[PDB]
Amino acid sequence: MIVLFVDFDYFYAQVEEVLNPSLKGKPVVVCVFSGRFEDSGAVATANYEARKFGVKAGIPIVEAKKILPNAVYLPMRKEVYQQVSSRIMNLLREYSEKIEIASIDEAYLDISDKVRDYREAYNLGLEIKNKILEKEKITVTVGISKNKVFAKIAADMAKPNGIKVIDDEEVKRLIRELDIADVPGIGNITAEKLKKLGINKLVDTLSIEFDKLKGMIGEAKAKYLISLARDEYNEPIRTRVRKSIGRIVTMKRNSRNLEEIKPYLFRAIEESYYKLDKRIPKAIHVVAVTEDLDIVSRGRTFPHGISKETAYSESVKLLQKILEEDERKIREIGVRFSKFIE
DNA sequence: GGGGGAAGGATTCC
DNA sequence: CGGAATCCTTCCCCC
Ligand SMILES: Nc1nc2c(ncn2[C@H]2C[C@H](O)[C@@H](COP(=O)(O)OP(=O)(O)OP(=O)(O)O)O2)c(=O)[nH]1
Ligand SMILES: [Ca+2]
Ligand SMILES: [Ca+2]
Ligand SMILES: [Ca+2]
């Protein structure tokens, strides 16, 4: 089996450069302004000229400006990037019917019934890269291997504007030499848990009693890692379907006053329904971020679709249920809709 | 005992 | 900052 993974380079920043070439060459930082105060919010992403100095996704906008006060700061226009993304995804579909659109800037293609060796795979990769650059002026990185995981690791190793195949012999070296933290799905929590168990590489997961691994990181995660370690991980590329749509917003100032929170909540409901389109959810959750940055939620699933009117009244109750069962103030409020009636 | 859900939260990654 | 998926634990009803 042959998997080709595509990951767009510094996506949001690069789309902005495509729409405004005068930006190419200088540091470009795409941000998500939270509105709490001047420059409050975070960096969604930045082009490589900016990353050289530490400005990257996730850092506070205020820290970014300290490092690169004269860079170009742009507000995130996610809708524009989404449409550019869709077009690129359609281009990729022209290379395989078996495509898994993982996120707004990445996808997996099962090109097994399209090519036979890694040679023809690599070449197909270059053609895909050329096609995208030519058509959307977007550079991307391609990773090729036997499964989704290593295809993705391959690209990570080739970033940016690269292409990289990880063949069977290297898959074995990685299992032995790859920091397990560098394995997709293994975050800081899980990685520290694995270190304590003496597991630093995929290979190590094979020298521990399963039940011990299971008990420490969970069944799903334990089996996942063991599969990879045994060089047996093999999940098929399949069409992913959105399972929830939501919106959470940061308020002007903290509060526990219902009348002061409701408009933010409703606005979130309004935006969520617009985005819902023709989808009808049977479930609703109201989400609150306390002053101490904790995230608390209360939801409800009914036996039928939720109308906007129902969403409004129910959401009010759930918020009321949150405030009554938590002494903290609310910093951010939102709603999420799921269990669609399709 | 154990199947089948639902609710709330933990993690992870874009 | 903030959108969203998967998986985990506890709680429940029920035969
Ligand atoms: N709001 C927000 N958006 C993010 C964050 N991280 C990534 N994104 C968005 C914007 C990124 O362009 C897009 C793709 O993420 P990657 O993880 O693929 O980063 P990006 O493509 O920007 O750089 P790259 O060349 O892949 O290293 O997802 C984040 O922490 N917050
Ligand atoms: Ca990505
Ligand atoms: Ca990317
Ligand atoms: Ca990691």
Side-chain angles (χ1 to χ4, degrees):
Chain A
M1 163 145 131
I2 289 181
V3 183
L4 186 146
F5 172 72
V6 183
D7 193 343
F8 311 162
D9 305 328
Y10 61 111
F11 200 44
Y12 298 2
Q14 192 183 180
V15 168
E16 293 292 344
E17 291 179 352
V18 174
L19 270 44
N20 188 168
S22 68
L23 295 171
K24 291 183 182 57
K26 31 185 172 176
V28 178
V29 189
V30 175
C31 327
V32 174
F33 296 87
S34 68
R36 201 79 167 183
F37 54 82
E38 185 174 291
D39 296 324
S40 63
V43 169
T45 195
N47 64 6
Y48 286 74
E49 293 63 56
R51 293 183 201 192
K52 292 192 298 188
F53 310 97
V55 178
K56 57 175 167 192
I59 73 167
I61 299 176
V62 291
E63 298 308 348
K65 292 184 169 186
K66 282 173 199 155
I67 306 172
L68 300 178
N70 299 302
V72 176
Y73 291 88
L74 303 175
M76 175 182 81
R77 296 189 294 169
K78 175 78 107 57
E79 292 82 3
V80 177
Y81 320 142
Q82 176 62 64
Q83 301 192 330
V84 174
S85 176
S86 293
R87 299 204 292 274
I88 299 180
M89 294 311 173
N90 288 347
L91 288 190
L92 297 177
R93 285 185 175 69
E94 315 185 320
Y95 288 80
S96 182
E97 308 75 7
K98 319 181 86 158
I99 180 175
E100 177 170 327
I101 299 177
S103 73
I104 187 168
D105 85 318
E106 76 184 35
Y108 296 89
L109 286 173
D110 180 320
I111 62 175
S112 296
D113 297 333
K114 290 293 184 175
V115 298
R116 45 189 182 76
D117 63 18
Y118 277 135
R119 177 184 74 78
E120 304 179 12
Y122 184 92
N123 288 328
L124 186 54
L126 292 179
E127 292 301 318
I128 285 180
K129 283 169 59 68
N130 181 72
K131 191 61 121 65
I132 296 173
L133 185 57
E134 177 188 299
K135 301 287 170 331
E136 296 294 334
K137 297 294 179 50
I138 291 290
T139 65
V140 309
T141 291
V142 172
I144 299 161
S145 191
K146 65 170 65 183
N147 55 49
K148 282 190 288 180
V149 171
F150 285 101
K152 178 182 236 300
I153 291 178
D156 287 343
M157 313 192 127
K159 287 186 180 184
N161 192 11
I163 174 164
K164 204 288 200 55
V165 164
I166 283 180
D167 61 38
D168 304 336
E169 288 311 296
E170 186 175 41
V171 158
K172 288 168 168 184
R173 178 183 63 61
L174 289 176
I175 289 175
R176 179 177 70 239
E177 311 189 8
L178 221 208
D179 186 336
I180 196 157
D182 295 338
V183 177
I186 299 300
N188 289 302
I189 295 293
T190 303
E192 291 292 345
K193 290 186 196 177
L194 297 165
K195 282 177 187 173
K196 302 194 201 74
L197 291 171
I199 300 170
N200 304 290
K201 317 285 195 178
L202 284 175
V203 61
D204 310 341
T205 75
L206 306 176
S207 303
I208 179 175
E209 293 292 279
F210 179 71
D211 286 305
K212 180 186 176 63
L213 231 197
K214 185 167 185 296
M216 202 52 45
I217 64 174
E219 189 173 22
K221 191 84 65 180
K223 291 184 170 186
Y224 170 68
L225 290 175
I226 289 162
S227 285
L228 291 171
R230 286 173 165 163
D231 192 309
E232 311 175 315
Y233 169 80
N234 202 55
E235 294 307 297
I237 285 66
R238 71 172 186 184
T239 303
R240 301 188 177 184
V241 292
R242 303 188 213 173
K243 294 188 178 182
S244 73
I245 303 287
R247 172 71 174 178
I248 183 169
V249 300
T250 300
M251 300 184 281
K252 220 302 173 299
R253 66 184 185 186
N254 278 19
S255 168
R256 303 195 70 277
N257 179 294
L258 184 69
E259 289 309 323
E260 188 181 345
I261 302 170
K262 288 164 65 183
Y264 287 106
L265 178 67
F266 296 154
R267 186 182 318 166
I269 296 173
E270 284 305 324
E271 297 187 14
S272 303
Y273 265 78
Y274 173 82
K275 191 172 179 180
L276 276 178
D277 233 320
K278 291 184 288 296
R279 311 183 194 195
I280 315 296
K282 298 204 298 304
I284 185 187
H285 285 73
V286 167
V287 185
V289 173
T290 57
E291 57 192 307
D292 55 301
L293 300 185
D294 257 51
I295 292 71
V296 63
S297 69
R298 292 297 190 284
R300 174 176 167 182
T301 309
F302 321 58
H304 54 74
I306 303 178
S307 64
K308 193 195 289 179
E309 303 66 53
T310 296
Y312 266 70
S313 51
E314 189 52 34
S315 80
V316 177
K317 304 188 207 292
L318 296 169
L319 165 57
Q320 301 188 313
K321 178 177 177 183
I322 286 178
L323 290 165
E324 67 158 296
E325 316 193 322
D326 200 87
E327 307 189 4
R328 282 79 69 63
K329 298 186 172 185
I330 298 181
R331 168 188 170 59
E332 314 163 45
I333 190 70
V335 70
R336 184 146 290 275
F337 293 101
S338 55
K339 293 188 184 177
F340 301 150
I341 295 179
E342 186 48 68

